Amino acid sequence: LAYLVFGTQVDDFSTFQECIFTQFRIILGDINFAEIEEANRVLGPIYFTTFVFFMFFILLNMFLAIINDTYSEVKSDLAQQKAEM
Amino acid sequence: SSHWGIIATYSGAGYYLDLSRTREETAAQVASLKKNVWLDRGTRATFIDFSVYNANINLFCVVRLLVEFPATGGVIPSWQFQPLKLIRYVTTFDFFLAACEIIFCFFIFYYVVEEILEIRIHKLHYFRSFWNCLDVVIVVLSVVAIGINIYRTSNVEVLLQFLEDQNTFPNFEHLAYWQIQFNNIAAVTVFFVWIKLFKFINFNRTMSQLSTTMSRCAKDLFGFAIMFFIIFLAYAQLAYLVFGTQVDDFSTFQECIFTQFRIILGDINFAEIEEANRVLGPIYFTTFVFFMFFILLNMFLAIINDTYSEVKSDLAQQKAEM
Amino acid sequence: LAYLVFGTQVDDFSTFQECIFTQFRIILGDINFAEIEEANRVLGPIYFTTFVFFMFFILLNMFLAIINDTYSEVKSDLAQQKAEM
Amino acid sequence: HVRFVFPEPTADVNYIVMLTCAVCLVTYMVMAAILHKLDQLDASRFKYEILVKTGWGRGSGTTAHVGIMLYGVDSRSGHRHLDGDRAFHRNSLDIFRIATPHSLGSVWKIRVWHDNKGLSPAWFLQHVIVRDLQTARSAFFLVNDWLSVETEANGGLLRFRRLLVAELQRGFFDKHIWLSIWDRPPRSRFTRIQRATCCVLLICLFLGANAVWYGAVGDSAYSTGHVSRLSPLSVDTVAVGLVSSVVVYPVYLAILSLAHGLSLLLVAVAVAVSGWVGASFPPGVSVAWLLSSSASFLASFLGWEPLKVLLLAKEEARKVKRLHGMLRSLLVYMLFLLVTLLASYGDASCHGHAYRLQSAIKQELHSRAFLAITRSEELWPWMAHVLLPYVHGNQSSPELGPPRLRQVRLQEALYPDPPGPRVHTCSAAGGFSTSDYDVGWESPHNGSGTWAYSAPDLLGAWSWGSCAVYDSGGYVQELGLSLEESRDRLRFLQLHNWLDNRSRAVFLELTRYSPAVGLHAAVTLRLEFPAAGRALAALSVRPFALRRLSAGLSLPLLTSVCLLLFAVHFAVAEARTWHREGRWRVLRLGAWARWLLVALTAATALVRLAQLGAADRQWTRFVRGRPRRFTSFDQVAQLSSAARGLAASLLFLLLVKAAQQLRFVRQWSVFGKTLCRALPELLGVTLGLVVLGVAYAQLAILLVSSCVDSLWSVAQALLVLCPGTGLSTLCPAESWHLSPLLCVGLWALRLWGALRLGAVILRWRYHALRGELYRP
Amino acid sequence: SVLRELVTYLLFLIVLCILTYGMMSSNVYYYTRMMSQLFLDTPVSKTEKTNFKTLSSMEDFWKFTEGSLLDGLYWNLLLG
Ligand SMILES: CCCCCCCC(=O)OC[C@H](COP(=O)([O-])O)OC(=O)CCCCCCC
């Protein structure tokens, strides 16, 4: 989506791999957004806001939820098979 | 036609000049315009328009420069450079692209007829799936894009009229407008088509677990997102009312929303917000940061973590017990 | 790996200590990525993307998993063996 | 004629109408949701708890019920079709209790109706033997009187005084549509949402009718604006409200299922028309419209609805009372929210225009050059090059009053320029001169010289500045002579060395006025010089709208008085519940919430009224003489700003409160509870984090002290770990001593991974709260 | 017993948090940075836009050693 929208104006989305790297740098907060918002006034900020929301408030929490559940289950069943037999 | 600039939406009328093909004559014309004062206190907007071709790669470029003079004084410039392709069929790759476009139209017809064959009698409700909604929005966007493309490429009479005599002004603004519209529609359609791929990744017991978790979590995620957005907009309106006349980062409500989203990433500039209000400036920032990272980011985790653990517990208690 | 790849070009990976400190600052969001991509067009972005992904979504979540499991177990044993008489 | 002239001649938008219709629709959307639950929940003391056996007559074998009606002060009840064992046998007594919550009184008003399942009962039922059990709303007095077929024997505890007077007590709070949504008796076909939908439609088309009158049929001589007074004259507001009510009232009776969706379509088109015709409204024709709508509603609530009436087993009643209280709370909160919304968001267009105006004023005053100041004696070319052309130039600059100059003397000279490094920030701080002087320099030779004292006034104090904080006074130089002699006066002041030596700041400030947008602006520049030579610069442009009390009953005045009455109502309601439980009402939200809400509500109105008074005072002072004085509107521009902030703060609280009211949905009630029970844990985590941060911060600040600029690895590993942006980029410039609160927020953004520790706690608590609301 | 330890620790901490105040409140940092700007970033001469922090050649060093260095050493100075 970012490549098709900003692919001829921004220069952080000139190529597909540049889009991937720029998306990885958005997470760490290293972009302008002054050039993203002016290259396209509508559908420009929509991409930014939805990307930030879904990356921070959904996917990171799912990663941590999976890790927490797996660690708890592993500790529980090693404490079950051991010290009880 | 209307433009939708930054301050207002300007009509397609006004007072105009077509310049010359030579530097000397255009310089004389603009000197004459400047001498007999043309821009005065009543001037509200000014446009400059032209185009170039670049025959090496067959691709026109349309350039528009706008300067707005608000009633309160000052100058606001903006610009637009748009490339177009109006002579499509020159090479074999263009014919290949045309064939692919025809294939796309056939695929869209197949999808819509498959949709209507099913919606007719089979499962009259059909809307409690969320995959049918995605299919219908995809086909609606695709047919809109096809209609825009047909309406836009069918007439190029401006280009044909310009090719009669080439000492006139070529008017390509509508073509650029519709090219931008088509690009937006196609990008959104591609995004949704790629999202639709989740319908088929259930090949083992881990994909189904995650999909079930997300489906069972969506409801109460919505329930808490209502509160999250209410608090977000409550902060945004306070920022708009307090800092909206001095900071240029809160000058409009949507800009307040964007700045608040940028604060989460850490892309904040404190050097201007701090002196806009010595009190209620730092208070807003610190309370926003604490209650956004320490409180509201963690309730999402609590909910997701609870539903995932419950899904796994149910799937492991049903199994190995039957 | 970063020292061996970007050692002679970047000036942030000129010495091993600088490599370590630069990685620590990358975790906290102090990316440059311009000379990183200029120095080596492939295997330069690969390092950045893999490092960011693993350090942001996987590796730093295990500390929280350990803390969460310990807190749950402590609370359970303190509230179940006590607060019953 | 003609009477429907085409509206919408422009594109501007009026926010008052949109906000009020949005509020009126949201309140209906929430009221219907609560009323649906109320109706689905109840879709299932007048007497005492003693026996009602009657055995004084025989020959009454017929399976029928009886009705005990007890009227009173808003208390009534019907019959009681219970399930007993006698089942109305041959000459048997029907004694049983009843679930009648009618809280009647011990007055002589009770009706006993004996029906007849076919044959009439010949038994003489005296009364029910009861004296005083729960409320004692009647007495056991024998009647044993027969009535008509399935009729009621009128008694104590067919003239025209009793034919339809019974309806005067029955439908008094039932046909009156307003005060009947929570007072509907059972067995009625109203569904308790119909009586809400109809009244919502009713108020909707009052709003629409008032808007269309004010927008489209003003052809009298135009009936408004030119010959209308904003203040109500009992004709401009009340008379139109009454006629707007009468001309469209009958459709309410006409509409009084599928016929109900057209009601929603009608209200939708009504609000659409109101918004469409509502665009072209002056500020007066909107407050007048609001007052007319309020008057119409008040008329329809007092003098019309009353004139249309002529033609497990114990705790299920707590919920209905709780919901009845909830409705009143909801209406109060909607009204308060509407008042706050009108107070804060009535001039958004002015907000955008003010931002643009201040930006333009800064950028055409060469703000870059002014802040690019190098010393304290080249500002005279600055004034001669960019200031005088900006003021006296024949271009867009309506000044509204000549400029002024007010410098300081400090009554003591200063040392020369410092060789090498200069003063840190504001070194060499002494006193301030306040005595008279003469022309050229401070030396009165005959009397009151040109350099007068110019004593401070009582307005727009200070301006917490770099060196010190002056309030109002200085060396008042008029700098007038608008046409051509302003430059001559500046040259004479420079040549005579007006403020050459011993001069702290300049404090130049005049005015602005944007005739198009309709907003004024106060510009204030200062060139505070800490040391002789190099100087600083600081300018502030405050745009504001000059509205004054003498303009009538403008929207801010109405919102201010409504906020004041809300504040006093909250104050008395809080004082009652404070005095009723005496003392020790502590360790709760309680006072520390109600008192603070009252404080905000009162402060908002008080500051707005003070701003309105100050604006009028300054304006009437300015009209005295224009080419004579300055009048320094700078104070008013401050007050408005403060007022705005206060209102914004108030609205913030209200919005937050709305969130905590989402717990009324059963599945959504957990989120509020969890955050309430994890507070001690979260506070402990924050205390630990801040102690660790203080320790590390003191380590870091005491660790370097060297300025080596080299890889001191042992000392670097601790200091330069997050110092690439923390050492001199996060907030080391001046925020460490100007805004200590901002530093902790800036360092919590950087180290936001630590704040994930809350996820360790909240999660657990959430899990616990899903083990006590599902299984038990 | 715990109260005695608490009060003696608070005394030992209140003495220490003000003993360190006299170490960081001596404005030594201001003097060091004043000297750093005095000696480092001042240009070698008005005709060269270079300073000690951006030296690149031996001739730049010879210019610096007869220039800003002498000005800083010669104009509370020159211990020995
Ligand atoms: C001795 C106390 C140990 C505290 C454990 C801190 C755990 C933690 O920081 O979690 C990682 C945090 C948020 O998660 P992630 O998505 O970035 O991996 O991401 C970050 O850490 C980036 C912020 C920098 C962390 C600074 C460490 C205080």
Ligand SMILES: [Ca+2]
């Ligand atoms: Ca389908």
